Design a protein around this ligand. Sequence first.
Ligand code: YQ3
Ligand code: MG
Ligand code: ZN
Length: 361
Amino acid sequence: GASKLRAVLEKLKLSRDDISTAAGMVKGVVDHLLLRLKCDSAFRGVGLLNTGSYYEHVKISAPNEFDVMFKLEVPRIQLEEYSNTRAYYFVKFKRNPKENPLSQFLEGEILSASKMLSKFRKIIKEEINDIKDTDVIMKRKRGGSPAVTLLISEKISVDITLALESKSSWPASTQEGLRIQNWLSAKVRKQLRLKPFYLVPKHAKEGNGFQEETWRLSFSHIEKEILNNHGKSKTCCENKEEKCCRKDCLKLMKYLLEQLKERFKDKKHLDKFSSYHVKTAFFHVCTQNPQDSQWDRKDLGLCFDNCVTYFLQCLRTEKLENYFIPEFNLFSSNLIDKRSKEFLTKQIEYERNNEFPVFDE
Ligand SMILES: Cc1ccc(-c2cc(C(=O)O)c3c(c2)ncn3Cc2ccncc2)c(Cl)c1
Ligand SMILES: [Mg+2]
Ligand SMILES: [Zn+2]
């Protein structure tokens, strides 16, 4: 039962050495690139964004795949929303106080996402050869993705995303997002919405191409902020009396998708699904279940089934709201095709009705 799930979780622990030394390798490379990007006129204000819930600059998103975010302070920034997509925006500036560093990537009033992403790639690619200490190479895509992808010693992959940092009020499309009021308090929502926010150069799907001057709102850095301060009680998991299973349910949810994605590797039906989809549904279940008593460590198997059922429902209805932007459907037909969503529903349906045989040893 939940005995199986506690055992899954015990075995996940055993591979923390591998992820930790992998993440140190990523940390090295990342620091070297940060040194050089700072040499450039355009990126001298660049720095690493603290996003990871265990490792500072390195978020883990797959067994051998890491996510790192470089942030760039871009002051006096004005947002024009692309075609009511809610998540995708054109970036302009307020005036010409004094000509800014980034003016090389302007096109009229608009800052091109692809033009700035392109000089980002060039600087990384030139630095990727020089330090022979470790063999790292670049990988393909560059299509409707903000990520520049390195492969380190042929095993470890790291996605590097440029992120404009805006200190302004969050845009209106997030007005009704981050619905933590009943869980973490209205006071905590007010403070989190005072933190900055980010724009990453992911490009909207237009027709069968991309609109590659659009940026996408990013709130990745809020995750650590809630994962590690996750209870209704400020002292949740700080003493032996308040031990919940919120973190273990998220760990189990990610592992479930990882295993399923590994098993349907033959015909790639599940390519488009990622741990981001699982985190989003998880935090939506923390919203439905706001009391620390709804996540007692003794109830692990039922809290897990709460998470799998909500995820299942999102797949069946083809609707998973962006946690920060409610009108942005992570599961729209535009983003994931209808056959894939159907495919995962059948598999997660099956796993759940059979007490997760994918977890068997
Ligand atoms: C409470 C809470 C806090 C943060 C996130 C969150 C947000 C973002 C985001 O940038 O929007 C995340 C994220 C987690 N992992 C990755 N990305 C970035 C991203 C960008 C484009 N496509 C997919 C993913 C969630 Cl889901 C819940
Ligand atoms: Mg331990
Ligand atoms: Zn807790």
